């Protein structure tokens, strides 16, 4: 009675080498380690998982199969993948790793990922020589494979006997190398009867091993689950080969972890009513989950929900046909491995949102205070804040998931809005919640929340408070086709290089002090407006209640959480307030670069404001004109390059830069064409006419890949073609200078009917003016944008033909991702009208023209 | 009358391209930019000169041709080479750089070199469009070459007219592109009559340009100096080609400069008498130079002296013959471009010694205080401090520039010693001075100073206070052949990796607090010993008076300077006290890694000692055994790898690591054979006998190059051969495992007489026990060292033949610099006895044997 596992093993060994290489990865889940390995080789110590182990453990922890807590002990820690992951978990307070080390064995790798200060990895530690210790969590990942089952059998038994005395009513996750051998089966059943738990297969395990993990949190039949894996591994022999499901690797953050500074203290007076109403509306499945993972957000309860969100995306057919050589390239397809599974949201939340920014120094808070007041007064020198209305909100909803067009039309919606507004006037909030993305009550509430925000704070956008004219540094309403010109104008200002540092997760870096300073605009409001805005700032912006989905072993739930600081990203006015605070922060950094702000000043509990006020009143506006600031994105050209080393205030404010050590000097550009801004850089093109154009540009694969993703999860063909045409129109207006794009532009537009009007939206950017969704000829639209209404184009004489509309320099094209070098492109370039003919065959018999 | 410069220009253009490439560098001075360019390309912002310009300006400043001070303005600053150099000069308070920038023009490069916080480099600044400003120093390096003299003529005149209004009784250094054209000559004479100054040729200028510099500090004939350059450039056409004199590039340090924190405040009560006696002994040339460059050392006066010190070295003939393929390699010859010119000392002093360490935090001082007291008590648990004597000092001088053998024999020397000692007992110091390396008064004083230091503090070395047995962490008296074994033993201790961070200029990082803590050993001394040691610590160690040479336009002078902290490197007890403080510092870092010491503790003005005392009394010794510490060099194997990120205390103590950003985590090893220690790493070699040897090793070129440098600046041939034989004996005893060395070992020893005994010293290291300077057979000496008296060699049965004395693994040999791969080595390998025959022909007819 040679078991199924032994058959699988016998078949596994009887394989060809390439028949083996095929099978061992067929259909499994696998993390992309490319960035990590490249980062690790350059000696980086932050963010990176030290091995594939971090991701492997994540899978168990995600599903609460093991919940690391208290003192964690990690046997055979190796490089430390499991240990570093545990360091950032809510209830973990200490991690001890033991591993053998020496020749032929992995060695602990020092890192500075989040919680490193509670991780103690020791090499030279053979666990089979170690006396058991007290711990709340026991991890073990030891097990060396062997082509002989009985060899693995003895190795597995050895592990189990070593590891058993470590177990005592505590969490555990233990690797069982060979679980199908009958003697091992017998030992596990004895183990399960004493310590509980169950065997689980990890999808990240290759098919070349039958390994499973004995986890503490679960029950079930050991013999059953083992054969279930055996069967699966057997079927994966005969079945057709499936390349691995590629998964994004883990981000473990950076810096020391102070556990006692993590927990959130909610203002229950403010957010209480909101929780109660949610609780009442979902009373039948409402519960309080003590196993929630939230370290930094206050948890108030959960209710059950249906599982939403796929871990993939759905591809636009028409444009995938006409861009055939890009099925070859990774990035265009890598953009389609989006993950909005409830697991994916939870991973993003932990790694990006579940953090706390240390309170800025008293001197730093003073500078921000002074600068903010000065900035708001400057921004309101001409304009006044005003209330927006139902009428106004309705029009914008009409013109621009939208049954919102029906909601704003339903009178009962506005009745609810009125009801909630009267609460705000009394200092109460009843239903203002947002999501990390019931009937229509849930929908009306949410849309009513956004209206009240729009009503009180919408003027910032609607009245263009951050236009360049009104804000000096702003670019609101300008458009992607003008941004390049603005950067060119900035480069003409004498001083240092042009700097463009990205903040790591800007919205999560907004402090309580930032919120306090953004709030000061209410001082310029009329009384009734003021109390409404004051309600929005205090009740919903400084006390946020959030809905977030979370997978559980028993099903998906919706968690109700709260947080005082950070930016509510799903809230109206995010862009303006981000622009405001960023403007302030970049002024503060400029003061530091110029020596007006010193380290002593940041620490000084009673900083003198005469110096700051003086600097702002004499140089404030001039310094604002040195900047281009769009939300969290910024370009700064300081008066000299001391700015590069000005890091004290920037870091203390909490606006830590992305992808660079906290205290490493910044690096800028003097060639304004190499400067990144709003996901673009900008090139200067001299036309044959002699006149100059400044055009937006970005990596081509980013443009190709975004277009091979259609809207509507279940789209037809009349829409998918119309979406593809919209991208084509965009490409011919904004990226006409890219050879592949303009050619692929003339491919889509001739493979889609002329009576068809481009539907849906290309991308959602505030800089997108969408001039490419129109009635009209693409050359006539082009002339209007780039010549006629372009203020940086002196001579206005139109362009009659498409080839005095220039391309990029050819080498410049290739450098930005053009494929015109490869022969695969030139071949794609002759299969042109065949590919056209192929899609127009799918669509049917309508209006086709031909585009060269 | 076409001038000499115009002839030179006419000849320069009429040259072949390779006849030009030859001439343009023939005989000029040139800085090695290789490290800088490689560093700059990796984005490093410290230490590196941004261009060759820093070195070029240095040449002028060195010779006081221009003395940058106050507000410095730098026209055509370019990358900023001149500006960054000025930032670290004594009297400079602000540096403003203006440069054009844009296409075809150099751009300012942001750096973090010392004084960056007073450097304001602005691009987009055309100086021919700029109104003149007030400044104390005007620098200008503008001038574009042209094959046409008259073109250069107009460009030069343009510069002169632009630059003249900037001049007003201030320092200046202005590039004069073409100085030989008659009209330019005429303009310069007019300029010189108004603003003074003179023209100077810079040796770093290529011969392809006639450029000179109008500097403010000097007078002389413009027409004369121009033709002097013309003549020189003309002669360099016909003369035989000389490859450039290669010079070491500039080191501009790192960090912010706080000018007001730089000046030294001398204790004139303590050091006054010493200055007075020096002043009296050199009263005829004694003066007070206000133009001294010392920012951080107190200056007290100068006297004139003869110029000492060459900028090159003198090569050992015998071993250069027998290592012919290494004339090809750079590093062996690069080791001979030593520079002990008075310029070189001044460059080293400015860049390395003329710095100030910020006072450590109060909490940090407490930890050091507690740890030091605990450490001294541990070190004195068995031994007592004792006085050393005249007899003892004499013997060591007899057995070991030494007319010191005559001085200790002269009774009048000891009379002076007694006289100075009686002052010390009264709390006075009269003649205790040392040097940065008159009659014999100067010599007796100095040697008498070192005796009194030896008398009071010599016990630390003479009684082996830092032997491994007595200090746990120490390696004094162990020997280079045992160090490797000690590291192997340390690797057996479980925990983190083995760390080996080098301190940048350890002796200059010794704080007043370090000195205070090292002083505590006097508490264990007898009264008479105590007052003598107390005199040494307080009068000469904590108040140092130093003699240093400095070049001036009029001649070399000797400056008398002083400093309270830092280690007197030319003083007795340096090694022991460095070992002590390093032991302490590495314990303090281990406390931080283990969490015993926190950031709050460092800042806490009244830190609690119960925690530290507890840690030391229970774990202190165990942690000491995790370390190998020899002076400023250390190897630490912490209990885990949190140590790598433990940087707070280390930096705050002032012991900043070398060649790594101040806050970047350290990187260690687990392979103990890759760990650097005492200029070596150590390999484990299994003999054919089966027994294992652990041997010292280092880059081979470092060993080759050190041996191709003889002692005695004017050596004969009987000594140079004897020095070469000493190296050969060393190589066969310590580096027998290196194939080239053991072969070159058997080459030197057979090319040098057997009746000749190896003279002089190989290298000066305390770990060198010099077993290679002996009467005896090299195999019998080898057996004694590696087998018989080796405690890590259990079986003691001797080795009869030289080829069970193993080599390194062959790939391991090549990796450490072996040349056995190249065919140039294999050819060197057959010209063996010819090369032997060649030297034995120089020596004469004596005892030659032959060595295989
Ligand atoms: N038929 C066949 N079986 C193999 C081969 N290599 C390994 N195996 C079997 O697969 C089992 C586990 O494979 P591992 O070698 O541990 O893992 P892997 O998939 O080869 O990946 P790596 O070990 O990282 O190279 C072994 O116990 C072998 O029985 C092979 O080349 N051919
Ligand atoms: N005969 C000859 N003269 C040259 C050549 N190149 C430059 N010169 C002369 O040398 C003068 C200065 O040389 P530069 O070109 O400024 O400097 P360089 O030595 O060539 O070094 P780089 O400019 O960095 O390439 C010019 O004004 C020319 O008159 C050449 O190739 N042949
Ligand atoms: N007897 C033993 N004692 C301690 N560690 C051992 C051991 N035998 C093997 N090991 C180590 O156990 C490790 C298993 S791989 C562990 C990977 C780790 N969980 C991570 O996420 O990175 C190997 O590196 C191996 O060196
Ligand atoms: N009209 C002008 N105004 C300002 N700078 C100019 C200029 N014309 C040329 N320059 C700049 O002057 C520089 C001379 S090379 C200067 C090197 C600099 N002293 C250093 O040590 O690094 C060039 O980089 C050139 O770009
Ligand atoms: Mg394999
Ligand atoms: Mg950006
Ligand atoms: Mg040249
Ligand atoms: Mg070292
Ligand atoms: Zn509300
Ligand atoms: Zn581009
Ligand atoms: Zn003295
Ligand atoms: Zn070596």
Author numbering:
A (entry chain A), B (entry chain A): 6 to 405, 418 to 454, 469 to 883
Task: Give me lines lifted from the publication on this model.
NS5 is a large protein of 900 amino acids composed of two domains with several key enzymatic activities for viral RNA replication in the host cell and constitutes a prime target for the design of antiviral inhibitors. With 900 amino acid residues, NS5 is the largest enzyme and the most conserved protein component of the flavivirus RC. Its N-terminal domain (residues 1–262 in DENV3) belongs to the S-adenosyl-L-methionine (SAM)-dependent methyltransferase (MTase) superfamily. The MTase domain of NS5 caps the viral RNA genome, a step required for its stability and translation into viral polyproteins by host cell ribosomes. The C-terminal domain (residues 273–900) of NS5 contains the RNA-dependent RNA polymerase (RdRp) that synthesizes the anti-genome and progeny genome.
Here, we crystallized the full length NS5 protein from DENV3 and determined its crystal structure at 2.3 Å resolution, bound to SAH and also in the presence of GTP. GTP is stabilized by base stacking with the aromatic ring of F25 and electrostatic interactions with residues L17, N18, and L20 of the MTase domain. S1 Text S1 Fig. The final electron density maps of GTP-Mg2+ and SAH with Fourier coefficients 2mFobs-DFcalc are contoured at 1.0 σ (blue). In the MTase domain, the co-purified (SAH) molecule resides in the cofactor-binding pocket and is stabilized by a network of hydrogen bonds and van der Waals contacts essentially identical to those reported earlier. The MTase domain is located above the fingers subdomain of the RdRp, such that the GTP binding pocket, the K61D146K180E216 catalytic tetrad and the SAH binding pockets of the MTase domain are positioned away from the inter-domain interface. In this conformation, the tunnels of the RdRp domain that permit the entry of NTPs and RNA template remain accessible. The MTase-RdRp inter-domain interface is comprised of two contact areas involving linker residues, the fingers subdomain from the RdRp and three segments (residues 63–69, 95–96 and 252–256) from the MTase domain. The network of interactions stabilizing the interface mainly comprises charged residues. Two Zinc ions bound to the RdRp domain are also observed. Although the overall molecular shape of NS5 from DENV3 is similar to the NS5 protein from JEV, the relative orientation between their MTase and RdRp domains differs markedly between the two structures.
